[PDB]
Amino acid sequence: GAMGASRLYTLVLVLQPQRVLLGMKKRGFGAGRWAGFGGKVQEGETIEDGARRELQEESGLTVDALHKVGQIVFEFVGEPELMDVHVFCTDSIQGTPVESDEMRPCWFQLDQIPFKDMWPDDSYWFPLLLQKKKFHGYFKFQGQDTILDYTLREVDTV
Numbered sequence: 001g002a003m004g005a006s007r008l009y010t011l012v013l014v015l016q017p018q019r020v021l022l023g024m025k026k027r028g029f030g031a032g033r034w035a036g037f038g039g040k041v042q043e044g045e046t047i048e049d050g051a052r053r054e055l056q057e058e059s060g061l062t063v064d065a066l067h068k069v070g071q072i073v074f075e076f077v078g079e080p081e082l083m084d085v086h087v088f089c090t091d092s093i094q095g096t097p098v099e100s101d102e103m104r105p106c107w108f109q110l111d112q113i114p115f116k117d118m119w120p121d122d123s124y125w126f127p128l129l130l131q132k133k134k135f136h137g138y139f140k141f142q143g144q145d146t147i148l149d150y151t152l153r154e155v156d157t158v
């Protein structure tokens with residue numbers, strides 16, 4: 001039948017030449033895993049404006065240019081609504097990251113990406129982000145640990 005309906009999300013990675021900023025999710029779904037900063041796009045908001053707002057809310061950072069780098073769709077067994085995640089990168093930030101109720105920011109060297117404490121799908125697409133390639137992905141999860149199906153492709157546009 002028809003693809004499930006999807007909810008629009010953003011995800012921002014501050015990626016510098018030798019390190020990347022992640023945040024430890026402190027509560028709710030995905031707590032205990034390092035992730036980029038993001039959340040649901042609000043009514044009337046552009047995707048990029050939502051990305052900037054979520055970055056500021058969760059990490060305290062404001063940034064200049066955000067670059068579109070990929071799109072990931074997540075599906076969970078037992079939930080009909082999908083997550084449509086628009087992924088952005090930036091390399092130039094203004095200020096110091098600050099812990100929020102949602103996220104504890106932390107820098108990681110690029111030879112110390114904490115995959116064991118990240119979502120399982122990151123093993124597949126996060127390397128593409130690091131290579132500066134654009135991608136579309138889809139992952140179907142049983143619970144929080146098990147991937148039942150996934151697709152991933154590199155693209156020139158997205």
Ligand SMILES: Nc1nc2ncccc2[nH]1
Nearest residue numbers: 030035074083119121122
């Ligand atoms: N990397 C990543 N973030 C996620 N958020 C929610 C569900 C699955 C996820 N995979």
